[PDB]
Amino acid sequence: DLVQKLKVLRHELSLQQPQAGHCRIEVSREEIFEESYRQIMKMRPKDLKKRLMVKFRGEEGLGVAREWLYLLCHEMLNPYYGLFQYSTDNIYMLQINPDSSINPDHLSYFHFVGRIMGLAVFHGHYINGGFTVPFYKQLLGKPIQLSDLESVDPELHKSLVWILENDITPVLDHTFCVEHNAFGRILQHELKPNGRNVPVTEENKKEYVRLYVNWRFMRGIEAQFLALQKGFNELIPQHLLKPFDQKELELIIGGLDKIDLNDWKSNTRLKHCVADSNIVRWFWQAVETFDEERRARLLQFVTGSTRVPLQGFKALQGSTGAAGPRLFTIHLIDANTDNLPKAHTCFNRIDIPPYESYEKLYEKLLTAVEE
């Protein structure tokens, strides 16, 4: 199982975390994207491996990287910024935008997104944002298969399938060079060192084919991916990803994308109330009533993030923030019943007033989650 292989990866990463010092990030909520960019990019990789201390500017009086990561991923992964775009054929998943060159500094922003992804995995946190299958395969360092290219370029796929099941000796005159229309002009690109003078033979056509497929998936997003990858590997070394596949990397990076209710209830603690308190009974009744989306907004309202750890609700306050696992807490406060439930994201605690009815609790709970 994944938690087993992950604990080996987390232990190797934990050895790289200097027990002395804190990685200090203080950004505003209204400028979280550009302020986090400036602060993270000013640091050296060694500085990012120190235990995280994220504070929102001003809000430190009356801090969590869980909420900061959530709000930061929400911003950087939005197509408004031109780094990522939704896929045409996977309208539910992000991919690198090939027209990212519009921003001349795009390569530094991709390197920053990579730093944020590595920082999240390194500190036991997750990234809210789903990527495509070739994104995870590329990030992992493993080669894309020829069958994955049929959907992307069926004419090139047809040609490369011909090469593999035919004797190219009396027919082909290819080199490890691909000539393509680069917007307005044809450009020769070598697939390997000195590819223009390396002919494709029966002895090396398998290598030529896998390099051509790899090159075609990187078309337009080469500089972008390289930048992201260098930021990600500054926290998560490439060798430590070796025991994982595309689906396992997607889970390591983003956590579970389904909230189990029984695990949420098993890892819930109560302050100022007991299991048979009306507020507790009513809260869980309102929670079964909520849809998968309303449940995720409730998790974000209380814990600061929509992300569920791969170990479940038991490991809620990630690897760093204060001491350890600060479990989801229901706190019955004595306060005016016209108030909305308060949330202390730093403790995964919801302060619920002593409502007089289930419907009263429901409407105030729903109203708090939409805000």
Author numbering: 377 to 438, 442 to 750
Original authors' sentences:
The structure of SMURF1 is typical of a NEDD4 subfamily member, with a N-terminal C2 domain for cellular membrane localization, WW domains for target recognition, and a catalytic HECT domain that binds E2 and mediates target ubiquitylation through a surface-protruding catalytic cysteine. At the cellular level, SMURF1 acts as a negative regulator of bone morphogenetic protein (BMP) signaling, which modulates cell migration, proliferation, and apoptosis. Ubiquitin transfer requires a motion facilitated by a flexible hinge that connects the HECT domain N- and C-lobes. To gain structural insights into the mechanism of selective inhibition, we crystallized the HECT domains of both SMURF1 and SMURF2, without and with a representative SMURF1 inhibitor, compound-8 (Cpd-8), and determined structures at 2.05–2.75 Å resolution.
In the absence of the inhibitor, the HECT domains of SMURF1 and SMURF2 adopted a highly similar architecture, comprising N- and C-lobes connected by a flexible glycine-containing hinge (residues G634–D639). Across all 28 HECT domain structures (including SMURF1), the α helix10 (αH10) comprises two and a half turns and ends with the conserved glycine, which provides flexibility between the N- and C-lobes through its high tolerance of ϕ/Ψ dihedral angles. To determine amino acid sequences critical for SMURF1 activity, we employed a fast Fourier transformation-based multiple alignment. These analyses demonstrated that G634, which stems the SMURF1 hinge, is invariant in all HECT sequences across animal, plant, and fungal kingdoms and in all 28 HECT domain structures. Function of the hinge is facilitated by its length and the flexibility provided by amino acid residues with a tolerance to a wide range of ϕ/Ψ dihedral angles. (A) In unbound-SMURF1, I631 of the αH10 (and other nearby residues) occupies the cryptic cavity, which is therefore not available for small molecule inhibitor binding.
